[PDB]
Design a protein around this nucleic acid. Structure first.
Lengths: 183, 182, 182, 183
DNA sequence: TCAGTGTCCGATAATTTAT
DNA sequence: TTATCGGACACTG
DNA sequence: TCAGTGTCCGATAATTTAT
DNA sequence: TTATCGGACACTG
DNA sequence: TCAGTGTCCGATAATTTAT
DNA sequence: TTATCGGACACTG
DNA sequence: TCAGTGTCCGATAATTTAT
DNA sequence: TTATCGGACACTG
């Protein structure tokens, strides 16, 4: 009954807001909502790490979808098991299912398990996608901003780099690089 | 390299059916590994060892799901581990293996369905403890010492470092029989 | 308005335990329907009747999944029929209901898991008998008629009707004992 | 392996090609690929009907994803029952499994079971969707086309309905309804 | 009254492949 | 995944 | 060389309740 | 669970 | 030769709600 | 889900 | 009124194989 | 799966 929220994001679609509104619509107050922008690091999840420090027997954490609490089924089951012993349950808003009962945890598991397999089948199709596009001749990576014909045409003209980097507005690091590559 | 694993938790120590089934499947005694729950923490030292002696390409065998893993959490981790190591599990009766992605899923599912049905039995077993507990069924090891001779000889005056020598019981139990019977 | 349903398929006709559970659950005996599968094609009249006598709002109780249904297809059908008719099923031991969307899914999954486990047991039993027609083992009902009193009487010049009257057996059999003992 | 294909479509996204492509890519001849586009009417899947009349023992039908062959899970489980007692088996490309074995069927069943659940959950959100908009004020249905301020302005004037529906290009049914509906 | 050149990374910024 | 940015150094004179 | 008396746990052994 | 088995202390006179 | 009038559908077409 | 077409009827004058 | 004789099934009871 | 009961024929003279 001592309600808590949790929201998480992993891509450009930082609609963390859309998550937090979903949380507040469900009666969780800003007071006890915990956020995580997974900066792509091994496991730098501060928000959560702070959530399990304040919850005590009685409380109920809320999350919007399954694939938020946990990246992978193995991790997520441990989390639930911990909490359970601690005396706290998790309610999933969109899935409309929850950890308080036994057939509850069962469904949760069954559900994220079908997720993970689907997740992985996509991951493979995405890597082959890169191969039949990479060998195809498609170009990957940041589009080139710099007018390089304006670097060659300025160095072959006598002038030194420090000068070139100031008149044009770019780092000197780049100027020399542009030179050594065009041989 | 093929490996076996068998485990037991109750009086039905047919570790033999398991160990035989594994042999039939082609596992040499040489690499079959055994554990038998004494009811301690997780002194599954036989398992602990088997996972030391495995390398990329090895395959472990087990007769049924609920052997390897007690709870689905513990189970999934063990596979997550073995998998990283380059090793797979093939379950004989359940007829599936951690070999593929779908494989793992079906394992994960079946244990999850098991744990569930296994929990309901526990709570049912427990509810039944109470419909015979208050009914009047006595619990414990059945009494064996003749208590109509311990109190019959102590009240006569004979010492307590002598009555345990006449009969065949410990000196701890004579003082327990006297004190408790008030 | 509550209803019950119990069913039985083997010697363990503890059809009572079921109806005790359905009365302990709060169904009036008025509303507890019953069937007992002889093993014939499909003679479940009790159900046939129940599904005629229920209206929107009613709930049917049943003790375990594997009662309402032999196989998972039938199982879903029954549910579907009831569903469009304003009635829902509640499985006791299992502790789930066809009340909701998730509700039905869970049921479906469970039966599917069960069916697989069921067809594996069938193929094992089926290899079990096969591989035990190599040693003994003697199948069939145990012989009762004194066959050493039939030959012993027929070689004595006596005729088959006499032998059927004297020993209280069928003339069908008199000849069969003989023609199957050369 | 008598190979066969099957593709199906239910919305504007009639990318029937993508499916038929997937099938050919997987190794079916157009010679044995079969096609159905539902029109929303009761049930008119004449294409499948045809194919299950032409298969025999040994044959294998291919399909791109689960939700193509079967609408609801019973209907799905029944086709398979039919096909099974016939000596055919279905392979699902993207889901990477087939009715081939016992465990096979189980997985198929479990998966569509999940599908149908999450599909109904979507559908009820679509329907509470038209409610946070129905009572919000929005008007549903076809946009009104007949100029009504010329039907009533022509009727109080006195003229009969028959003359009203002949002058303006409207059916006499619509005249009466418009009148009876607005007073 | 120190100052200019050129090299070598780790951060940071935009970009592709897929449901 | 490739591009640029901002600095840290190690040289020269 | 007490030399016995009395209490107070940590191991084991035999049991019960249920699929 | 409850019953026994072997001890370890902490005191006696 | 009705010949005009008013009602009550089943079919179609055009629309909105959403992942 | 609401807006129109075409008809099918059952009446009147 | 035969009156007797043998052969060949379909239904059930008992009994096996396994969880 | 087998063992047996009650019969339904087909034969028998």
């Amino acid at each position: 009954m001592a309600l808590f929220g949790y929201a998480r994001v992993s891509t450009s679609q930082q609609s963390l807001d859309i998550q937090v509104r979903a949380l507040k619509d469900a009666g969780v107050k800003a007071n006890r909502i915990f956020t995580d922008k997974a900066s792509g690091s091994s496991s730098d999840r501060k928000g959560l790490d702070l959530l399990r420090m304040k919850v005590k027997e009685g409380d109920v954490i809320l999350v919007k979808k399954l694939d938020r609490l946990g990246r992978d089924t193995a991790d997520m089951i441990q989390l639930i098991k911990e909490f359970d012993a601690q005396g706290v349950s998790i309610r999933f808003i969109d899935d409309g299912i929850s950890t308080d009962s036994y057939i509850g945890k069962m469904v949760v598991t069954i559900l994220s398990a079908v997720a993970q397999a689907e997740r992985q089948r996509i991951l493979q199709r995405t890597n082959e996608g890169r191969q039949e596009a990479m060998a195809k001749g498609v170009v990957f990576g940041r589009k080139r901003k710099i007018d390089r014909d304006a670097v060659l045409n300025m160095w072959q003209q006598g002038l030194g780099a420090s000068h070139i980097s100031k008149t044009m507005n770019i780092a000197r690091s780049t100027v020399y690089k542009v030179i050594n590559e065009s041989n």
